[PDB]
C-alpha cells in the first residue's frame, strides 16, 4: 500500500511563509526522492523541485531558488517544503510525488524519471484578505431581455472570504432551471459567484423569488427577493 | 509551458486519437524521455506513460507512447467515457536543467453533438450602483464540448483588465456552464456608450451588449 499523504489546506497572506508536509509509507522512503508541483487554478502543471531522502540533495526551479526549501525527516519518513515572502500568483493546489527511481548513489538522475506515486493535494491560497461576508445583488430581468416564455434571474454574490457560499431558491421549493456557477477568484483577494434560475414568464408577476445565501465563514446568511425591472 | 501540447482534442467513444507533445533543442530535441500524465478533474495526476513508450503496472493497455526526435504523442485506442482528463506530457530541459511540462491538453470524449452557447448579459444591478461598485455578468450556459474564450469590449474597443472568467462546469445534461465579469466604476459605466461581452465557442464568436443609457 504505496502512499504520500499530504498536509491540510493554508491560507495565508502575502509576505507571510507556508510549510507542507508529505508523509510516506508503504514503501522505504530513504530509497527515493520527493518532487513538488503545484498547480494555479485552471492552469496546467509547474514543477518546483525534488529532494532526495537518503542524502538531502535538492535541485530547485530557478523562478523559485532563495525562496524555496525542502527538506527530509528520515526518521519519520516524511518530506516537507517551504515556499518564503508567498505572493497572491503562489495560490495553487502543491503536490508532492515520488520519482520512480532508486538512487544507486547519484542523486541528480531523480528529476529524469516518471512520478508514480502521488500526494493528494494541498491547497495553499494566498490572499491579503480575512473573514468578510458577502455583498448580494440582483439579477433581474427586464422587458427587453425577455423575448419569451421564459426569463432569466439570479443573484451576484459579491466579494466574499473564504469559500464556501451555498445558494438556493426560495429555501429549497424552486430547483429546476437553477444553475449556481463556481466562485472565482479575484485580484482583489476576494471570492465571486452568481446563480441563476430560468423561470416561466406568466409567474413573474405574482411568484416570489428568493436567492438564499449561506456564508458560514462570516456567520451569515442573506435572503434577497429578485423582483423584474421597471424597463 | 515549455512543451507545446494541443489546447483540446476529442473523439466518440470506441475511436481513437493522439495528443501530441512538441519542444525543442534543449528538451525533447535533446533525447530525453517523455512522460504522460492524466488528471481527472479535482484529483491528482497519474502516471500513464513513463520512458516515451512504457506502461506502469495497472494502466490499461489502451494507453501508449511513442517519441520522434521533435515530438511525442500519447495515442489512446478505444475511447471509453473515463478518458475525459487532462494529459500533460513531462520532460526534461538542460539549460545555464529543470523538469518542464506541457501545457495540459483537455480530451473530450464526445456523448452528444455540439451546442453552441447561451448568453445572458446582466448590466450592474442598481443596487451595486449606490455601493459605488459596478460588475458586468456574463453568463453562459449550454454549450458543448465545455470550452470558451471570454473577450470584453468597452464601446468598440477591447477591454484588457477587470475580466474574472471562471472555468467552464457541467451542468445537469452534461452540457457546461461558465460565467465571466466586467468590474467597473460607476462613471466607468455611464461614460461608455456600450459594453459587450464576446464568447468564443469552437471558433464561433456570441456577443451580447449592454448600454447605460437603455435600460435592459
Known amino acids: 500500500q504505496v502512499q504520500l499523504v499530504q498536509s491540510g489546506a493554508e491560507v495565508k497572506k502575502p509576505g507571510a511563509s507556508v510549510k507542507v508536509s508529505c508523509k510516506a509509507s508503504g514503501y522505504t522512503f530513504t530509497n527515493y526522492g520527493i518532487s513538488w508541483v503545484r498547480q494555479a487554478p485552471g492552469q496546467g502543471l509547474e514543477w518546483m523541485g525534488w529532494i532526495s531522502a537518503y542524502k538531502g540533495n535538492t535541485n530547485y526551479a530557478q523562478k523559485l531558488q532563495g525562496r524555496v526549501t525542502m527538506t527530509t525527516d528520515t526518521s519519520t519518513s516524511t518530506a516537507y517544503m517551504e515556499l518564503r515572502s508567498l505572493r497572491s500568483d503562489d495560490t495553487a493546489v502543491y503536490y508532492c510525488?515520488?520519482?520512480?527511481?532508486?538512487?544507486?548513489?547519484?542523486?541528480?538522475?531523480?528529476?529524469?524519471?516518471?512520478?508514480?506515486?502521488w500526494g493528494q493535494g494541498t491547497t495553499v491560497i494566498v490572499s491579503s484578505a480575512s473573514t468578510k461576508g458577502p455583498s448580494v445583488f440582483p439579477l433581474a430581468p427586464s422587458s427587453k431581455s425577455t423575448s419569451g416564455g421564459t426569463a432569466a434571474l439570479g443573484c451576484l454574490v459579491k466579494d466574499y472570504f473564504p469559500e464556501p457560499v451555498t445558494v438556493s431558491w426560495n429555501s429549497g421549493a424552486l430547483t429546476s432551471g437553477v444553475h449556481t456557477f463556481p466562485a472565482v477568484l479575484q485580484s482583489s483577494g476576494l471570492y465571486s459567484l452568481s446563480s441563476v434560475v430560468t423561470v416561466p414568464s406568466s409567474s413573474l408577476g405574482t411568484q416570489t423569488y428568493i436567492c438564499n445565501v449561506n456564508h458560514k465563514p462570516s456567520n451569515t446568511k442573506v435572503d434577497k427577493k429578485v423582483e423584474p425591472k421597471s424597463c | 509551458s515549455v512543451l507545446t501540447q494541443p489546447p483540446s482534442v476529442s473523439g466518440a467513444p470506441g475511436q481513437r486519437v493522439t495528443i501530441s507533445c512538441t519542444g525543442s533543442s534543449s528538451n525533447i530535441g535533446a533525447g530525453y524521455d517523455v512522460h504522460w500524465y492524466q488528471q481527472l478533474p479535482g484529483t491528482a495526476p497519474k502516471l500513464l506513460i513513463y520512458?516515451?513508450?512504457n506502461r506502469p503496472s495497472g494502466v490499461p493497455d489502451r494507453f501508449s507512447g511513442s517519441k520522434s526526435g521533435t515530438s511525442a504523442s500519447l495515442a489512446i485506442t478505444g475511447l471509453q467515457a473515463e478518458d475525459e482528463a487532462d494529459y500533460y506530457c513531462?520532460?526534461?530541459?538542460?539549460?545555464?536543467?529543470?523538469?518542464?511540462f506541457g501545457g495540459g491538453t483537455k480530451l473530450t470524449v464526445l456523448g452528444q453533438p455540439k451546442a453552441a452557447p447561451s448568453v445572458t448579459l446582466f448590466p450592474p444591478s442598481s443596487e451595486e450602483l449606490q455601493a459605488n461598485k459596478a460588475t458586468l455578468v456574463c453568463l453562459i450556459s449550454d454549450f458543448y464540448p465545455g470550452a470558451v474564450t471570454v473577450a470584453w469590449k468597452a464601446d468598440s474597443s477591447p477591454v484588457k483588465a477587470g475580466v474574472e472568467t471562471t472555468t467552464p462546469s457541467k451542468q445537469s445534461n452534461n452540457k457546461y456552464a461558465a460565467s465571466s465579469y466586467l468590474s467597473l466604476t460607476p462613471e466607468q459605466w455611464k461614460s461608455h456608450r456600450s459594453y459587450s461581452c464576446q464568447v468564443t465557442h469552437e471558433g464561433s464568436t456570441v456577443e451580447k451588449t449592454v448600454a447605460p443609457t437603455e435600460c435592459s
Open positions: 520512458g516515451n513508450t
Open positions: 510525488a515520488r520519482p520512480d527511481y532508486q538512487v544507486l548513489g547519484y542523486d541528480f538522475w531523480i528529476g529524469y524519471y516518471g512520478m508514480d506515486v
Open positions: 513531462q520532460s526534461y530541459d538542460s539549460s545555464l536543467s529543470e523538469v518542464v
